[PDB]
Every structure is written in C-alpha cells, then in structure tokens.
C-alpha cells in the first residue's frame, strides 16, 4: 500500500499523551522504561526526551519542538498538540480528491495572514511599571503549582531583571544563578546582589567583615609538589625528614607574600588544599577556599573583574578582581560565603529552599522560564491578553477573510480557522464541564464591539474578563507557536518517496 496515511497518523498518536497534560491542574502519564525508575513531571519536554519513537518519519517534530525551549521555554505544547488538528481535517480533505499541495497553500496564506493581526490587538505598556511586571508572572507560575508562595516569590524575579538592564536595553538569563538546598521552607527565598559559594570555612578565626576585599583567582592544587618524573624521596636520617617537606611550605610563605603584597584579601582555589596545609592559613588569617568547580571559577571571575591566571608567581594587582563585602553566616545549620560589589553589581543570584527535594527541583525549572517570558517583554513592551482568549478572536475575523478568496483553496483556509477552538475545549473538560455548550457564549462577547479580554476561567467556570484578573502573555508564544506548527505539518504533507535504502550515511 502507499502507507501515506500512516506518516499523519502517527504524529496523532503522540499528541494524545501531551494533549491530557496542556492545563493548569492537567494529569500526566508515566511511560517507564523496562529499568524501573518511575517518576511523573507535568512538562512536555520531559517527556518526548525520554518517550521512545517506532518510525523514522516521528523525529522531525522533535527537533523542532526543541528549538522554541531554548528561546522561551514555555508553549511548546501548544504547538504540537494544534498541529494535529491540521492532520485529522487533511484527512476529510483527500476524500474530496485535494492533493495536498493545495492544502499547503492554505495554511502558509493564513499563518502570514495572523501575523498582522496580533500586532493590531497588542497594546503598550511602561518599561518600568512595576504593577504590570506582577501580573505577567504568577500567569505562569500559578499554572505550574505554587499556590503557597506565589504573591512574594514574583517580587523577588521582577527587581533581579529590572537590575540587569543594560544601556542597549536587554537582559541575559546568564548572569542568574540558582542553587537549590533543602531547608526551612519556601518562604526563605530573598534577593541576593552578589554569588553565594557553597562551602565553609576551615577555620572561625577569619574577619567577620572585611571592606574592599580584592580577589585572588588561584588555580594550582594546595598540596606537596612532586617532579613529573618517575624518582621518588626516601627519608631515612632523622634529620632530613624536615627539609624536603620544609622547604616546599616555604615556597607558599613567598608566594602569599607577592599575593599578600598585591593588596590581596581572600583566595578560592579549583581544586583541594591538604590537610597540613590549612594549620598555616589558619594561625596565620588567611582566607581562601577548597575545591571550586569550573562552573563557579567563571561567574566569580567576569563579575568582580578577575582574570584567568595559569601562573601564580607573578599575580599582579591588574590580574586581581575586586569586591565590597565578604562576609559568611550561618544559616540552617550550614554556612555559605558572600561576594557582593555594590560599587558595580553586574550579577545576581536567587536562593531557593524547600522541605523536600521534590519541591526544591520544581521550583529550580520555573525560575528559568519565568525570567525569559518576562525578559521579552522588557525589550519590546507588547502584551496580549491570553487566557484562551487569542485563538477565540482569530476564528471570527479569518472566517470573513476567506470570503475573499475564491476557487479550491478556501477549502484549507477555513479548515485552519475552525482548527484553533481545540485549545479551549481542552480546558473545558479539564475543569469538568461540557464544552460545545460553553462555546456558544464565549462567542457572545466577540459579537461586534464587544471586549477582547474574555476568556474561560478554570477557577471560578464563567466568562469574565481576563484582563483584570491578570491573564495576559507576550506576544511572541503565540505567533511563533502558530508559525512553527505551519512550518511542521508541511514535512508531512509534502513528503512522499519513501525508498529502503542502505548504508545511506
């Protein structure tokens, strides 16, 4: 047979697993591998990287759905569950003997034609209006699960953007760090305007607070030096055992002292200090850590203006960083470093801290997201209300536009317009309520001159107006959402010649 029917079929097949899970209190499914670990998590993209494909012509809407989470993250699901709607109406479509090339033309005509719309419908806003950087966050949040600490924890996202705008006008996801670490609750999540290093002193006897700390980047294991070479050290006089040993401790005294010279104040070494090695630093007062991962050693550079220095015999001051306060306390036990510069914070940092590891994981995946929707936002200032609100307004007007053209194509046009009403009905039988009931007087408001802010409300289950409430989004989720889907279902349309080859390469 063709088996062309196969190739749309099989991408339906896996819209119905995501198709459940688009919603704010949406169930999940658990597709465990033969191994065992079993584990549930409320996210589209967590599932198609580990759920398994049986055909080769499956992978296409993968790498593409892959390419809007490292651009806004959320709204993939959107994408990939409309697109099955466009394939499930092609199927009426080749009954009445339309080749699909025709129903390609419809759907690249409409997808130019939305565009212009929505930038008719998105209004302005203020660059620094506070109260309209609060709605656009709990949006997001509340539908991910966080109804405890949610009217504090938008606070905490919205002044650590607004901090690190630039002159051009941007921001970067970069330049924020999180660490989890299980703790008190929730509620101790606080602003931060430097880094914070996770790790302890080796010694109580270090300055409380100290002004004016410059940084010195080490990179050289605090150890025993030994020759490359294959030649070991035998000790037998007991009066030789306190030179080879000797002498190299002295070598640090020299080099502490060109670091001590150079204005230095605290230290953070890559790697392990040795055991003998941490007496000196302490009786001494010298502060300087143990074990920085590469990953820490670059924020901790580039923010307080430290340099990479491979050789440490001749740390200059111009290679030395610098800092305003450096300060550790306690807290919950534990105890973390401080590296604050108030005279140029170009970096911040969000702790989060949770009862279970569970928690502190999820919360860890939502902050990434919600400093991206909202950074957008920041540079081009146009919001749309949404809420299940947008697609509603384009199934009215595009049905007048197909009016407009005439012969076999307004077949397609209209077959995507009648296709983007399946967001809201998802929504419907979520909250367990019939659907083609409700349908029928959403559209009463979209009549004439009516609002464009009305949308379903999950919580309280009647038409009201989603812009007070504080339903709104950019509007870029949803023109790239409706473009990528326009820009996917031509691989399946458009492809046909399906030879077995052989060591193709």
Same mark, same amino acid.
């Given at each position: 047979?063709?088996?062309?029917?196969?190739?749309?079929?099989?991408?339906?097949?896996?819209?119905?697993?995501?198709?459940?899970?688009?919603?704010?209190?949406?169930?999940?499914?658990?597709?465990?591998?033969?191994?065992?670990?079993?584990?549930?998590?409320?996210?589209?993209?967590?599932?198609?990287?580990?759920?398994?494909?049986?055909?080769?012509?499956?992978?296409?809407?993968?790498?593409?759905?892959?390419?809007?989470?490292?651009?806004?993250?959320?709204?993939?699901?959107?994408?990939?569950?409309?697109?099955?709607?466009?394939?499930?109406?092609?199927?009426?479509?080749?009954?009445?003997?339309?080749?699909?090339?025709?129903?390609?033309?419809?759907?690249?005509?409409?997808?130019?034609?939305?565009?212009?719309?929505?930038?008719?419908?998105?209004?302005?806003?203020?660059?620094?209006?506070?109260?309209?950087?609060?709605?656009?966050?709990?949006?997001?949040?509340?539908?991910?699960?966080?109804?405890?600490?949610?009217?504090?924890?938008?606070?905490?996202?919205?002044?650590?953007?607004?901090?690190?705008?630039?002159?051009?006008?941007?921001?970067?996801?970069?330049?924020?760090?999180?660490?989890?670490?299980?703790?008190?609750?929730?509620?101790?999540?606080?602003?931060?305007?430097?880094?914070?290093?996770?790790?302890?002193?080796?010694?109580?006897?270090?300055?409380?607070?100290?002004?004016?700390?410059?940084?010195?980047?080490?990179?050289?294991?605090?150890?025993?030096?030994?020759?490359?070479?294959?030649?070991?050290?035998?000790?037998?006089?007991?009066?030789?055992?306190?030179?080879?040993?000797?002498?190299?401790?002295?070598?640090?005294?020299?080099?502490?002292?060109?670091?001590?010279?150079?204005?230095?104040?605290?230290?953070?070494?890559?790697?392990?200090?040795?055991?003998?090695?941490?007496?000196?630093?302490?009786?001494?007062?010298?502060?300087?850590?143990?074990?920085?991962?590469?990953?820490?050693?670059?924020?901790?550079?580039?923010?307080?203006?430290?340099?990479?220095?491979?050789?440490?015999?001749?740390?200059?001051?111009?290679?030395?960083?610098?800092?305003?306060?450096?300060?550790?306390?306690?807290?919950?036990?534990?105890?973390?470093?401080?590296?604050?510069?108030?005279?140029?914070?170009?970096?911040?940092?969000?702790?989060?801290?949770?009862?279970?590891?569970?928690?502190?994981?999820?919360?860890?995946?939502?902050?990434?997201?919600?400093?991206?929707?909202?950074?957008?936002?920041?540079?081009?200032?146009? %919001?749309? #209300?949404?809420?299940? +609100? $947008? /697609?509603?307004? !384009?199934?009215?007007?595009?049905?007048?536009? =197909? *009016?407009?053209?005439?012969?076999?194509?307004?077949?397609?046009?209209?077959?995507?317009?009648?296709?983007?009403?399946?967001?809201?009905?998802?929504?419907?039988?979520?909250?367990?309520?019939?659907?083609?009931?409700?349908?029928?007087?959403?559209?009463?408001?979209?009549?004439?001159?009516?609002?464009?802010?009305?949308?379903?409300?999950?919580?309280?289950?009647?038409?009201?107006?989603?812009?007070?409430?504080?339903?709104?989004?950019?509007?870029?989720?949803?023109?790239?959402? %409706?473009? #990528?889907?326009?820009? +996917? $279902? /031509?691989?399946? !349309?458009?492809?046909?010649?399906?030879?077995? =080859? *052989?060591?193709?390469?």
């Amino acid at each position: 047979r063709d088996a062309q029917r196969m190739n749309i079929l099989a991408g339906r097949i896996i819209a119905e697993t995501v198709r459940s899970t688009l919603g704010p209190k949406g169930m999940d499914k658990m597709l465990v591998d033969d191994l065992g670990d079993v584990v549930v998590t409320n996210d589209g993209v967590t599932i198609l990287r580990e759920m398994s494909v049986e055909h080769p012509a499956a992978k296409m809407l993968i790498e593409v759905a892959k390419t809007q989470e490292k651009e806004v993250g959320d709204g993939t699901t959107t994408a990939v569950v409309v697109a099955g709607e466009l394939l499930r109406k092609a199927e009426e479509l080749l009954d009445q003997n339309v080749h699909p090339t025709i129903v390609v033309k419809g759907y690249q005509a409409a997808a130019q034609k939305a565009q212009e719309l929505l930038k008719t419908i998105a209004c302005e806003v203020g660059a620094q209006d506070k109260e309209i950087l609060t709605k656009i966050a709990m949006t997001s949040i509340t539908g991910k699960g966080a109804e405890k600490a949610k009217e504090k924890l938008a606070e905490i996202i919205v002044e650590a953007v607004s901090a690190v705008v630039d002159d051009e006008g941007k921001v970067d996801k970069d330049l924020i760090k999180i660490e989890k670490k299980s703790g008190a609750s929730i509620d101790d999540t606080e602003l931060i305007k430097g880094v914070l290093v996770d790790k302890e002193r080796v010694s109580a006897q270090m300055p409380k607070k100290v002004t004016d700390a410059k940084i010195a980047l080490l990179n050289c294991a605090i150890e025993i030096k030994e020759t490359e070479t294959d030649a070991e050290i035998r000790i037998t006089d007991p009066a030789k055992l306190m030179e080879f040993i000797e002498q190299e401790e002295k070598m640090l005294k020299d080099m502490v002292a060109e670091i001590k010279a150079s204005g230095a104040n605290v230290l953070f070494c890559q790697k392990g200090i040795d055991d003998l090695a941490q007496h000196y630093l302490a009786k001494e007062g010298i502060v300087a850590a143990r074990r920085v991962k590469k990953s820490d050693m670059e924020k901790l550079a580039k923010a307080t203006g430290a340099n990479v220095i491979t050789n440490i015999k001749d740390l200059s001051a111009q290679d030395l960083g610098d800092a305003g306060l450096v300060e550790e306390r306690k807290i919950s036990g534990d105890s973390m470093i401080f590296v604050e510069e108030c005279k140029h914070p170009k970096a911040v940092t969000m702790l989060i801290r949770g009862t279970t590891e569970h928690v502190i994981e999820e919360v860890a995946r939502a902050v990434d997201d919600a400093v991206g929707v909202v950074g957008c936002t920041i540079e081009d200032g146009r %919001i749309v #209300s949404g809420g299940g +609100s $947008t /697609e509603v307004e !384009l199934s009215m007007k595009l049905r007048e536009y =197909a *009016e407009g053209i005439s012969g076999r194509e307004q077949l397609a046009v209209r077959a995507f317009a009648d296709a983007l009403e399946v967001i809201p009905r998802t929504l419907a039988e979520n909250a367990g309520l019939d659907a083609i009931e409700i349908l029928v007087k959403v559209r009463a408001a979209h009549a004439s001159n009516g609002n464009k802010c009305a949308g379903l409300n999950v919580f309280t289950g009647a038409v009201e107006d989603m812009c007070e409430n504080g339903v709104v989004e950019p509007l870029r989720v949803k023109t790239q959402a %409706i473009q #990528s889907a326009a820009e +996917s $279902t /031509e691989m399946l !349309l458009r492809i046909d010649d399906v030879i077995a =080859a *052989e060591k193709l390469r």
